[PDB]
């Protein structure tokens, strides 16, 4: 069932380091902000004309070191960048200048999260801590509880929780081999998740916000319930799964293995498609793996940022 | 019958040499890793939620 084929449609050249992270806003479907190892963000405008799927719009210089995680705002006009210089930068997606410079992490920041609304900034850093900031730039909360580095923090979207609660729930993980849930208003702990043999490389809550997918070094992908606080399922990728991403339309998990990109069909608990682009002049032992994954707003296109300094887009083209 | 010249050199213990470096330039110390047990597979331990 669902004989869905996805084919590479364009390549977004222009970066100069590994495209570490990607982000897309639901409101604005034709804009894509990508941060790379070249210490710069790039805003891409997507064109449905010919070979190139997008067009770079603005490069955001101002970061001294590696840019790890990139998050766009809900409205699609602001972008928060986490870099390896222990600082966070807020950028106006049109002006190109920085608005706020969040400072306070003693270790280089690895991930950043946007609030459901435009209120709070959640940042994870190597200093074993999480920081909650306002949009102005000051740090409101210093959440502890992790004894090692925290690599990924992405907010669980509130779908239909009771009506309304004014409570902000997200997850956090890193080299502590644990996954933690946090609730904000106040701004304290929630349930835990201990399933990983090795340390967690990346976590990503489902678009609805009730499934949390975590991945690690051993390629052991775990899927948990947050609102139920229980395990949902478990698979093995048998490679290095660098990044993973849910899909808005389909019930799918893209996983960036060290060898290629797997897609897991969640309802059938079986992988369906594998993505391995064709490079040239290599030795098949160091083919550029994927480090960043991001689906489109609808769930029609997939953006993958590789170590070959390239964004490649796979458009879903169901060949019957 | 003459003069004797005397030269004395002492290399202090670098670990006890305060106000400066505390080791030789090529002295590399590696922290011994801590040993932990991984077997707990499901382990969805639940804290009391707060709001």
Which tokens in the block code for residue A180? 């933690």
Whether the Cβ atoms of residue A212 and residue A203 lie closer than 8 Å to each other: yes
Q: Do residues B29 and B21 make contact, with C-beta atoms less than 8 angstroms apart?
A: no
Q: Is residue A1 part of a domain?
A: no
Interacting residues of A199 by C-beta distance below 8 A, sequence separation 6+ = A148, A174, A175, A176, A177, A216, A217
> Is there a contact between A245 and A254 (Cβ–Cβ < 8 Å)?
yes
Q: Is residue A3 part of a domain?
A: no
Contact A216, A256 (CB under 8 A): no
Name which of A280, A271, A273, A277 is nearest A306 in CA terms: A277
Domain annotation covers residue A267: yes
| Chain B residues closer than 8 Å to A231 by CB | 42, 44
B40 contacts A191? CB cut-off 8 A: no
Determine, yes or no, domain membership for A29. yes
Query: Residue A213's CB: how many other CB atoms inside 10 A?
Result: 24
Question: What is the C-alpha separation between A267 and A248, in angstroms, rounded?
Answer: 14
Sheet with A179-184: list strands edge to edge: A150-155, A168-174, A179-184, A188-193
CB half-sphere exposure, B37, CA atoms < 13 A: 3
Closest CA to A208 of A269, A160, A275, A173: A160
SS3 A242: coil
Report the alpha-carbon distance of residue A266 to residue A190 in Å, rounded: 26
What is the spatial distance between Cα A6 and Cα A9, in angstroms, rounded to a whole number?
Answer: 9
How far apart are the C-alpha atoms of A317 and A292, rounded to whole Å?
21
Q: How far apart are CA A175 and CA B1, in angstroms?
A: 74
Q: Which of A21, A17, A22 is nearest to A37 (CA)?
A: A17
And the tokens for B2?
């003459």
Structure tokens at A187: 């701004």
Nearest CA in chain A to B44: A193
Tokens of A179: 């996954």
The reply to whether residue B44 touches residue A188, judged by beta carbons under 8 angstroms, is no
Q: How many angstroms away from the CA of A15 is the closest CA of chain B?
A: 37
Q: How many CB atoms lie within 10 A of CB A201?
A: 23
**Inside any domain, residue A131:** yes
- A194 CB neighbours in chain B (<8 A) are 40, 43-45
Point out which residues pair with A59 in neighbouring strands: A42
Quote the tokens at residue B33. 């890793």
Tokens 């999480």 found at: A130
Q: Which residues of A touch B45 (CB under 8 A)?
A: 191-192, 194
Residues A250, A251, A253: CA angle, nearest 5 degrees: 105
Q: Supply φ then ψ for residue A234, to 5 degrees.
A: -155, 130
Residue A2 lies in a domain: no
Number of domains making up chain A: 1
Q: Which experimental approach was used here?
A: cryo-EM
How close B34 gets to chain A, by Cα (Å)? Answer: 12
Q: What is the largest CA-CA distance in chain B?
A: 93
Residue A307 token pair: 């170590």
Q: Please report, for the domain that includes residue A17, its CATH number.
A: 2.130.10.10
Short-list A274, A291, A198, CA closest to A6: A274
Tokens of A229: 């606080």
A247: Cα within 13 Å, side-chain hemisphere: 18
Question: What does the longest C-alpha to C-alpha distance in chain A come to?
Answer: 57
A30 domain-assigned: yes
Strands A120-125 and A109-114 turn out to be antiparallel
- Residues A203, A218: Cα–Cα separation, whole Å: 14
Please indicate, yes or no, if residue A294 is contained in any of the structural domains. Answer: yes
What's this structure's resolution in Å? 3.3
Beta strands A6-12; A311-316: pairing state: antiparallel
Cross-chain Cβ contact A192/B42 below 8 Å? no
How is the beta sheet containing A78-83 ordered, strand by strand? A67-72, A78-83, A87-92, A98-103
- Which DSSP symbol is given to B16? G
- Collapsing DSSP to helix, strand or coil, A114 comes out as strand
Q: Which among A32, A2, A17, A23 has a CA at the least distance from the CA of A71?
A: A23
Quote the domain boundaries for residue A113.
9-320
């Amino acid at each position: 069932s669902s004989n869905i084929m996805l084919v590479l449609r364009g390549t977004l050249e222009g970066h100069n380091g590994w495209v570490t992270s990607l982000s897309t806003s639901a409101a604005q479907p034709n804009l894509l902000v990508s941060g790379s190892r070249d210490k710069t963000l790039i805003s891409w405008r997507l064109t449905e004309n010919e070979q190139q799927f997008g067009v770079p719009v603005r490069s955001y210089k101002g970061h001294s070191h590696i840019v790890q995680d990139v998050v766009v705002s809900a409205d699609g006009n602001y972008a928060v960048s986490a870099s390896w210089d222990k600082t966070l930068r807020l950028w106006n997606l049109a002006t190109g200048n920085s608005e706020a410079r969040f400072v306070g992490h003693t270790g280089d920041v690895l991930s950043v999260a946007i609030d459901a609304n435009s209120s709070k900034i959640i940042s994870a850093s190597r200093d074993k801590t999480i920081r909650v900031w306002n949009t102005v730039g000051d740090c409101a909360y210093v959440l502890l509880g992790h004894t090692d580095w925290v690599t990924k923090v992405r907010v669980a979207p509130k779908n239909l929780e009771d009506v309304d609660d004014g409570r902000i729930t997200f997850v956090s993980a890193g080299m502590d081999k644990i996954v933690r849930s946090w609730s904000l208003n106040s701004y304290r702990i929630e349930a835990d998740f201990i399933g990983h043999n090795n340390y967690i490389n990346v976590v990503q809550p489902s678009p609805d916000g009730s499934l949390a997918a975590s991945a690690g070094k051993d390629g052991q992908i775990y899927v948990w319930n947050l609102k139920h606080k229980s395990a949902f399922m478990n698979f093995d990728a048998k490679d290095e799964v660098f990044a993973l991403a849910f899909s808005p339309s389909r019930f799918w998990l893209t996983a960036a293995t060290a060898s290629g990109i797997k897609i897991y069909d969640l309802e059938n608990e079986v992988l369906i498609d594998e993505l391995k682009p064709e490079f040239a002049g290599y030795t098949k032992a160091q083919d550029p793996h994927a480090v960043s994954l991001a689906w489109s707003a609808d769930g029609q296109t997939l953006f993958a940022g590789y170590t070959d300094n390239v964004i490649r887009v796979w458009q879903v083209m169901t060949a019957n | 019958q003459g003069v004797l010249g005397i030269k004395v050199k002492i290399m202090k213990d670098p670990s006890r040499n305060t106000s400066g470096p505390k080791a030789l330039p090529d002295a590399v110390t590696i922290i011994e890793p801590k040993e932990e047990e991984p077997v707990l597979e499901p382990s969805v331990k639940d804290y009391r939620p707060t709001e």
